[PDB]
Amino acid sequence: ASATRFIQWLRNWASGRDLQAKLQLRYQEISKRTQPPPKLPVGPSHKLSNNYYCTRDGRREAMPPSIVMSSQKKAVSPAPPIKRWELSQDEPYL
């Protein structure tokens, strides 16, 4: 931040950029190192009623694998063919 105006011009010209607008050294734009206390929200299971665990028990909804064939018509692929990607409109060529 404290470079002389001549030195600012020299390193701007040499680099070809406006370095002063995006200095890699941090000054006072950063957040204060002491912040006000948070007050964090609670999740959707924080209820006093209509909140029985057996209605929101993901672990107990898991099942053993479905057995399709055990050693005890149109052809198919494992999924539909992937759709061809589109060229970026933001910038197709670097």
Binding site: R59, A62, P64, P65, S66, M69, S70, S77
Partner: protein, 206 residues
């Protein structure tokens, strides 16, 4: 339901249909086909079928599993064939993954799949090193992870966590030496399993 992972029945149905497809085409080798509740397809095969099944899945136009994601082994000592060989394949054409599993024991070799996937070269060296499964017709089978002269296969369930030997530098012989392992603090085994059943859906019959 915010905390529960949502189902995807469309993919479950697609994978089931393709599972039957593979079983119908390779009945000589396929022993079981299952789709997990989170939509993953596993083809369980006889070990003789490794090359035919993998080749089919790589080259068939309705499969095209061109990429071998991972090849590994699992040790289950209670099984007559304690080693389960797991191939995780990926198809970029159909944006899908399949898993192929076979089995072997300590003395029965498995055909090397290097001819199907060049990726298999080192994966099979690692399985040989860590589990002691021999792969027939492997171009260059030898240890890859363990130290030279290391005895045993550390990923077997009956290999001790800290092994049998440990190294130190000895001034008298002016070299690093190997000696039987002694620990200043033994690893403390914990019994964590609750005596109460957790998941009724997986209860085995008495």
């Amino acid at each position: 339901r915010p905390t529960v992972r949502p189902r995807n029945d469309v993919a479950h149905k697609q994978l089931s249909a393709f599972g039957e497809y593979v079983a119908e085409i390779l009945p000589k080798y396929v022993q079981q086909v299952q789709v997990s509740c989170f939509n993953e397809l596993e083809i369980c095969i006889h070990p003789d079928g490794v090359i035919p099944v993998l080749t089919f899945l790589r080259d068939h136009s309705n499969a095209q599993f061109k990429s071998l994601a991972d090849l590994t082994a699992v040790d289950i000592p209670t099984r007559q064939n304690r080693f389960e060989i797991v191939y995780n394949l990926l198809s970029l054409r159909f944006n899908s993954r399949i898993r192929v599993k076979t089995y072997t024991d300590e003395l029965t070799p498995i055909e090397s799949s290097v001819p199907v996937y060049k990726a298999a070269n080192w994966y099979e060296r690692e399985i040989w090193d860590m589990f002691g499964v021999f792969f027939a017709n492997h171009p260059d089978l030898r240890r890859i992870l363990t130290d030279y002269g290391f005895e045993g296969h550390p990923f077997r369930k009956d290999f001790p966590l800290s092994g049998y030997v440990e190294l130190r530098y000895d001034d008298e012989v002016k070299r690093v030496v190997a000696e039987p392992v002694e620990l200043a603090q033994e690893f403390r085994k914990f019994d964590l399993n609750s005596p109460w059943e957790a998941f009724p859906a997986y209860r085995q019959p008495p």
